[PDB]
Each structure stands twice: as structure tokens, then as C-alpha cells.
């Protein structure tokens, strides 16, 4: 969740590898936006009785609520598609299992997650922790030895018009925003935030809970920002300014780490293998959070209750189908399945407004929210974000079609 999701990796790394440091601003303005939007959901969770799905359902009739539920469920399926592609690529790099077979393997990683469960949570998550830290150390090493120009990075943080001019920078930009502001984290946070310690009617107990939840929500989002910048700089350092126009996917990073001159041959192979294991670990951890979010969305909109293993199997089954169809059409082209990997996050950008608007409506309401209320500052910046985001989505959809 955040810096572990493969969508952030592919969008940031391809943004840097294809358009230099330009999209850095899109990483910042989105990472800030999330910090605000999450902070609203937190309040919506703690101030009002229950989470976002129940509120949106409460303000809508059953048909339109079913439509919203279709949009949200499709977003969850999109993230699942992202980590399905991630795990498939990892199994192709480590064990040589083709993508069409690995995608089929990703249906039973629940079983495999039980097998890991038998080995204890703390130990395996510590192994994955040292793995992620080691891989990040490799990336910091690559950026450090690339001799980057700091003034060009800080120049990259400055916005440019070209971000909306051509379809490429705008496409990767929508992918970055959709990957950093995941719509399912709003429904998830708006309910998991209500498990803290406070009396439902005593109010500074609540404001204390929102103080904490907001502080944490900004901490991990800060880390996700830093990691996203480190990855965009990684792809920009390895594949930008190249005569062959390497798009900068997971395979390009794999062979770039494996053929790095100073990094050696066997050592570089160790680095690349660790990166692949970190990609599989990236594809294994998002599933539980996706399952809880799907429970909140389904029980909130449709008021239907099914077990978490069942909806996990259903969401995974629906997620593998477009991956398999993509692999059959393009004959297992890795660059194409990575293009699908980006398109999933772009679809998250498409699905963002349907979750942002009811959040604004419920948060601005005086009766529902009471003392905790959207300061008109929040209403201004938030309505600005909804307007400009929906405008960018409609603009891209109309331009491409």
C-alpha cells in the first residue's frame, strides 16, 4: 500500500525514463492532494457514524448507487490487475514461468499466503522489510553513481504546460495521480479509522483520534512521495536520453541492474534477483487491504455480505481475465502487459471523481459533520481538484477517441 504497489513503480519509473524530471510536479501535487483527501475521509469516519460507502449509498437511490458500486468495484479490480501483472512478471524473471501461466498461478496465491502464514507474520515481514530496504539501497546507489543534476530535478518540480499538451505526459500523469490517490483507500480509511479509542459522542477524544490518524496518514504518504521521486529519478537516470527510447519497464530495470558496469556481473545479478523478489512481495501484500476495501464498498453500497476469501477469489478471477486476454492478443508481449499495468492506474484516475464528489458533499454538510467540518480552505482546494481532475479525464478520453 503506497510505496509497495507496483503501479506507483511502473508509472513513476516510466515517467522518468520517458519524459525526464517533468512529471516530478505531478508526483508532488498528487502526494499533497492525497494527504488532504485522506485527511477528509478520516474526519468523515470519526465525525459521522460510518464510512464513505454507506454515506454515498444513503444519499443515492439503489440504481445510481449500483452504478457507483460498479465504478468502485472496477477500481479495486484495476488494482488487483496491477499486482497480478506484477506477480506474473516476477515469476517470469525468477523462475522462468511465462506470463500466461503465472497469471493463472495468481488465482491460488491465497493458498500460498496461508503457507506463508504458517511461517509467522513477523519473521517473513522482516525478511520482506530487509528486502525492500536493500532494493531501495540499490536504487539510491544507481541514482548516486549516475551523477544527477540537482538543479534539473528542482526544475522538474516546477510545473509546465506540456504536461497537458501531449497525450504521453498527460497519460503517465493520470497514471501517477491514480496510483498515488487510490479510490479504494478512501472507503478503506473511512472505516478502519473508526477502530481507534474514543467515545462516539465525546468530541475532543475524536479530535485527538483525527489528530493521530492525520499524522500517520501524512507520514506514510510522505514516504510514498519520497519513494516515487527516487523511482522517477531512477528511470530518468537509466533510460532517459537514450537513442533507443527504452520505455523503462520492470524488464528494462532488471537488465539494467543486471548489466550495470560498476555493479559487476554476479553482484548485479544478485541485485536484479532481489528486485524481482521485491516485485513479487509487492504483489503479495496489497491483497488483504484490497479485500477489506472491497468488503467496505460492497457492504456499503449493495448491503451484501460475503466472506473475504470468496470475494478475494472473485476479484482475482475477474482481474486475471483481462491480463490473459491481453497476453493472448499480443502473444505474451511484456511491453504490452506493462502498458495494461499503466492503464489500470489511469483507470483509477478515471474512477477518482465518483469517490471524491460524495466525500466533498458529506464533509461540507453541517448536520452530518457538526464541529468537525471542511474549513472553506479545504472546500476551495478540494473542489478545485475535483474540477481540474474531471476536466483532465474527460479531455484525455475525448482526445484519444
Amino acid at each position, epitope marked *: 500500500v503506497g510505496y509497495m504497489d507496483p503501479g506507483n513503480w511502473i508509472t513513476s519509473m516510466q515517467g522518468g525514463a520517458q519524459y525526464g524530471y517533468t512529471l516530478l510536479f505531478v508526483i508532488l501535487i498528487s502526494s499533497l492532494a492525497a494527504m488532504l483527501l485522506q485527511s477528509m475521509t478520516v474526519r468523515l469516519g470519526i465525525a459521522t457514524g460510518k464510512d464513505l460507502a454507506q454515506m454515498t449509498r444513503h444519499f443515492l437511490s439503489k440504481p445510481v448507487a449500483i452504478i457507483f458500486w460498479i465504478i468502485a468495484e472496477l477500481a479495486i479490480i484495476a488494482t488487483d490487475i496491477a499486482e497480478v501483472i506484477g506477480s506474473a512478471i516476477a515469476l*517470469d*524473471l525468477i523462475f*522462468g514461468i511465462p506470463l500466461i501461466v503465472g497469471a493463472l498461478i495468481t488465482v491460488f496465491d491465497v493458498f500460498l499466503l496461508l503457507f506463508i502464514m504458517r511461517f509467522g507474520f513477523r519473521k517473513i515481514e522482516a525478511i520482506v522489510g530487509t528486502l525492500i530496504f536493500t532494493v531501495l539501497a540499490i536504487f539510491v546507489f544507481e541514482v548516486f553513481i549516475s551523477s544527477p543534476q540537482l538543479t534539473d530535478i528542482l526544475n522538474g518540480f516546477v510545473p509546465h504546460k506540456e504536461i497537458v499538451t501531449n497525450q504521453g505526459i498527460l497519460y503517465i500523469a493520470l497514471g501517477i495521480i491514480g496510483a498515488t490517490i487510490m479510490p479504494h483507500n478512501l472507503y478503506l480509511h473511512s472505516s478502519i479509522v473508526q477502530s481507534r479509542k474514543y467515545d462516539r459522542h465525546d468530541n475532543e477524544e475524536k479530535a485527538q483520534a483525527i489528530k493521530y490518524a492525520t499524522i500517520d496518514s501524512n507520514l506514510q504518504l510522505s514516504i510514498a512521495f519520497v519513494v516515487n521521486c527516487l523511482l522517477l529519478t531512477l528511470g530518468a537516470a*537509466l*533510460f532517459f536520453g*537514450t*537513442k*533507443t527510447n*527504452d520505455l523503462g519497464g520492470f*524488464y*528494462d530495470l*532488471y*537488465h*539494467a541492474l*543486471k*548489466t*550495470e*558496469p560498476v555493479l559487476g*556481473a554476479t553482484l*548485479g*545479478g544478485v541485485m536484479s534477483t532481489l528486485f524481482a523478489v521485491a516485485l513479487l512481495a509487492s504483489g503479495q501484500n496489497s491483497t488483504i487491504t484490497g479485500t477489506l476495501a472491497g468488503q467496505i464498498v460492497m457492504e456499503g453500497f449493495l448491503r451484501l455480505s460475503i466472506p473475504n476469501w470468496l470475494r478475494r477469489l472473485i476479484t482475482r478471477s475477474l482481474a486475471v481475465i483481462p491480463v490473459i486476454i491481453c497476453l493472448i492478443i*499480443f*502473444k505474451g*508481449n*511484456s*511491453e*504490452k502487459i506493462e502498458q495494461l499495468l499503466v492503464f489500470s492506474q489511469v483507470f483509477l484516475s478515471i474512477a477518482l471523481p465518483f469517490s471524491l464528489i460524495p466525500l466533498q458533499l458529506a464533509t461540507s454538510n453541517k448536520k452530518l459533520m457538526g464541529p468537525f467540518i471542511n474549513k472553506t480552505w479545504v472546500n476551495i482546494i478540494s473542489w478545485t481538484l475535483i474540477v481540474i481532475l474531471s476536466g483532465l479525464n474527460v479531455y484525455l478520453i475525448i482526445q484519444t477517441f
Partner: nanobody
Amino acid sequence: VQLQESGGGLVQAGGSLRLSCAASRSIFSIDTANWYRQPPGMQRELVATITRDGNANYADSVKGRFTISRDRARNTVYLQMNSLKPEDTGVYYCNAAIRTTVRTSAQEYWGQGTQVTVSS
């Protein structure tokens, strides 16, 4: 860095083989690949061609039966030869444009051909 071929050998008409074209050391990318062959007493004939974007083309004598492909995880160009005929017998060569690192210029490489014999 040398281009190494494998997967050839002896097979009966109707069977299948799979040629493997790899490199001696770790490579970043094989941008373009061509599978040539030479039958006894005939000229060197271009059989398969795969490009950077993944598109491929085959000779009319081999189209529909042969399939060149790129394994990107291992940087290995494969030639899947199905429904083999006795005239497919010959020495198969692999020509490939290897890119040692990311920013190195793409270089041309050939390789010692492998023997393919379709008997009876």
C-alpha cells in the same frame, strides 16, 4: 561476448524443434534478430525476423509453421519449428543486434550455426 545457439538436432518429419539463441554473458537487450538457414547444396536463406517492437516475419516456405520470439527475461531469441519437412534440413544461423548496456550502441553479432536434420 559470443552468440550461442542450441536446441537443434535430429527429428522425424512431422515433429518439432525449438532453437535457442542466447549470449555468452549478461546482455541488456537484443533489439533485432534474424534466423538464417542453409540446406546442403543451396544458398543461405533468411527464415525468421523479429524486430524491437515484437513484430515478426517469416519466409513463405516457413510461414505458418515457424515462429520466432523474444524471451525478454532471459534475452533469448527462440525459433519454434513445427511440422518439420525434410527440406528444412540444414545449418541454422542466428544473427542478432546485441546491446551490451543500456546506452551502448547496438552491435551486430553472428554465431556458429547448429545442425538440424529432419529424417525420412
